[PDB]
Ligand binder design. Sequence first.
Ligand code: HEM
Ligand SMILES: O=C(CCCCC1CCCCC1)N[C@@H](Cc1ccccc1)C(=O)O
Ligand SMILES: N[C@@H]1CCCc2ccccc21
Ligand SMILES: N[C@H]1CCCc2ccccc21
Length: 455
Amino acid sequence: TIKEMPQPKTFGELKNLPLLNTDKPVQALMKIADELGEIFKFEAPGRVTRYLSSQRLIKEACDESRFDKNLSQALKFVRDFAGDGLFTSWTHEKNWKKAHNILLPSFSQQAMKGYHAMMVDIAVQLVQKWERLNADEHIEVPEDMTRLTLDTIGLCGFNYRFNSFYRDQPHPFITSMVRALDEAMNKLQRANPDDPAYDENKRQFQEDIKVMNDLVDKIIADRKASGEQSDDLLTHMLNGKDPETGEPLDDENIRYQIITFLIAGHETTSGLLSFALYFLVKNPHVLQKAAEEAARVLVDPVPSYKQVKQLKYVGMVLNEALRLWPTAPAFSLYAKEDTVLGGEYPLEKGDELMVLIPQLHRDKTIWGDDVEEFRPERFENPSAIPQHAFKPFGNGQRACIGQQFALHEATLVLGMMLKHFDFEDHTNYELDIKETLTLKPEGFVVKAKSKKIPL
Ligand code: HEM
Ligand SMILES: O=C(CCCCC1CCCCC1)N[C@@H](Cc1ccccc1)C(=O)O
Ligand SMILES: N[C@@H]1CCCc2ccccc21
Ligand SMILES: N[C@H]1CCCc2ccccc21
């Protein structure tokens, strides 16, 4: 029966907008969900979002006949530099299905066999860094995980070394990209974006866009000139033809795809690894079980593709980390037609929804009494998990194209970490979650003790 939707506290003419005037807006929306329940309406001047938290409503939202991917205001601001790349394109834009058809074979489980050697190159650099720390020293976990995942996509993406493990200060491309991502998220909080107080922010944003376009356009121009045929995404994009249109991607679209993959390499897999290590050091019995698997499976100096596929428990640890702290914490949908959600909430064509993935993953009606516990065994049997209960990679045709790539890299790296080191939570770290487009532990530090196993 038709029901009024709950709404959080309002601030006069600003409606709900000041609630997201925080450096931690996803965590603020999570606390609102805990108070108000499975659905609430969020109003700002000239916009309304509905936030979904229950598997009961999210299983309907994931119906692709009724709901399509929406560009949230965040993705609309990211589109100023990610353009009509896969992540910031509407499903109905020609370049979405065209790039999707061309890039799917580059991201398949088969393709991971070709990327494996480049992933091992960077993973070996991480292990050697930790082997070379002095007794007195500690590891900055998200810092080192972000060095690794950025370098991996640089090498598999377009055969470029960011050489992040040689640096204290990021490569200039990365300085610009991080500052562009920060400006996109900060613009969400501006009641009056045209006020001249923000004129410096706008000039810096254009300069940062220019820096990203110049390196990426030069890399594309340099590859075309040389005719080199490396086994990277850039070669696949320069050579590939969409079976449907018979057309290749143009150079502008290739640039947007590369910027998109570099954003992913910086923002996502690094968060997953950082949360996975956090949960392992907080759950020593789980760390022991994962370390025992790494020791039994990784019998060679270098992991092989086939050995990574056999790290089943490590896979389960990664899924249980994605459950409790999904590094990509939301995706947006619009109603394709007038419709009723959950027999209760009427929606008009075009109405926007936001899926709060961390809340979905805490639904006690799905996961049971032990929902706050880190228990990778709950992923033993995928058929035992209710439909649409677990969405860390999004939904349907607009799900993460990088899912196989991220899980292969994360499983390889976590396996090698568990083979090579014992870990100590030497500070009794209190979880502090920094938000960009994604969630990461901030200030998470550990000490490693080498098991002295040669590479
Ligand atoms: C643990 C790591 C990752 C997580 C949790 C993750 C999560 C997501 C999610 C939730 C979406 C759906 C977004 C939406 O509906 O708006 C998505 C889309 C996407 N991801 Fe990832 N991602 C990860 C890693 C990667 C990597 C490494 C890449 C590329 C190298 C990548 C590339 C993309 C792209 C291109 C899309 C858009 C797909 C499309 O609409 O056609 N992701 N990702
Ligand atoms: O829910 C949020 C704030 C958390 C985004 C987190 C999201 C950003 C993309 C990647 C996944 C994580 N933003 C909505 C609604 C909105 C719009 C304008 C002003 C304030 C809120 C939006 O961007 O459409
Ligand atoms: N994995 C996609 C593309 C890269 C950045 C991002 C951020 C939030 C959610 C999904 C994604
Ligand atoms: N993105 C890397 C580049 C190398 C330097 C650095 C430092 C902290 C955190 C990340 C990074």
